[PDB]
Amino acid sequence: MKLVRFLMKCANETVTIELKNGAIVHGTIASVTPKMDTALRNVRYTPKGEEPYSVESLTVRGNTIRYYILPDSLPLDTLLI
Amino acid sequence: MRLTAELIQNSLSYLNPLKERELDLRGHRIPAIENLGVAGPHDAIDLTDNDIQVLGNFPLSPRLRTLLVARNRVAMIHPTLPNAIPNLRNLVLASNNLTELSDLDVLGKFPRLTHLVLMDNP
Amino acid sequence: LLPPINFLFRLLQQRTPVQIWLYEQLAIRITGVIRGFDEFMNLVIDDAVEIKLSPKTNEPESKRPLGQILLKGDNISLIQALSGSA
């Protein structure tokens, strides 16, 4: 399938994204762009060796994002179907 | 008037002449420092032409560097002000009532304070 | 005006010795004769030898032949042609 289509189908859910600079951003996604530029709502971001912070809206680039973890109760099979 | 969230939002946020973000609440006659979280992060604070009597009750603002509480009625400095603003570099309190040796000792014990303005004071 | 593609084609036709210092590594070189090329500057050199130079005086420390080695265009950085002594 398509990764962008899968992200759009699995959007509006609480996910945690690990960015390759050692960052961890946890929150519910508000919008997912076709270029993996996901905008999240009520996000908490903690960098590597830095104190965590909370932001209402934040955008993370797909190239800068290394990995993503969605909720365990999300219907992955229904989203990929 | 009282320092409220609407007054903090209507305070003039612009760029200072020293190339820094400055929030000024002049002409509001704030009796005390309040709604610091509503004001948010500001590098310079300008509470000139106000009626602030206590120099304190500020939130955790490490980004604050410049403070100008001149032309006010501040007579004492709270001990939590240096903890709330440990990175403050410029402090101006001209034409105020701050003339205490304890206030001078607190200003000296402030670690990042480099510029001090205390003219026209007892 | 000699383009880089024309220069690479002329070097491949002449089969002259070429040493290519790799990208992000000033002490790694590949010495040989260019036999093939692509649009992404993928140079395949026959009888190639990988040379690891010393970090102090930039002298040749280790040399190891590998035969036909295909070097990536992003991997290869600085290619210089050396004229043989006839």
Partner: protein
């Protein structure tokens, strides 16, 4: 090709190891794949090697492991793939 191998692994639902260039290993069964080498997997075991430093001296390596319910790996972060 690699896309056919990823599709076969996703169809077989067999555990595979993805080596990420930041020194990471991810053992997980293949569930989804993309054209840009981006994969979605379930029940992922993440392993890494850490070298603590005590009093300015390098210590012995330690293997750290963690479990994730659902994970997504990008093709840029993924360096190597091994099918088991």
């Amino acid at each position: 090709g690699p896309l056919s191998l990823l599709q076969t692994a996703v169809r077989s639902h067999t555990q595979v190891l993805i080596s990420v260039r930041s020194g990471r290993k991810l053992l997980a069964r293949v569930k989804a794949f993309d054209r840009h080498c981006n994969m979605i997997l379930e029940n992922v075991k993440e392993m890494w090697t850490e070298t603590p430093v005590t009093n300015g001296k390098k210590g012995r390596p330690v293997n750290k492991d963690r479990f994730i319910s659902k994970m997504f790996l990008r093709g840029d972060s993924v360096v190597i793939v091994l099918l088991s």
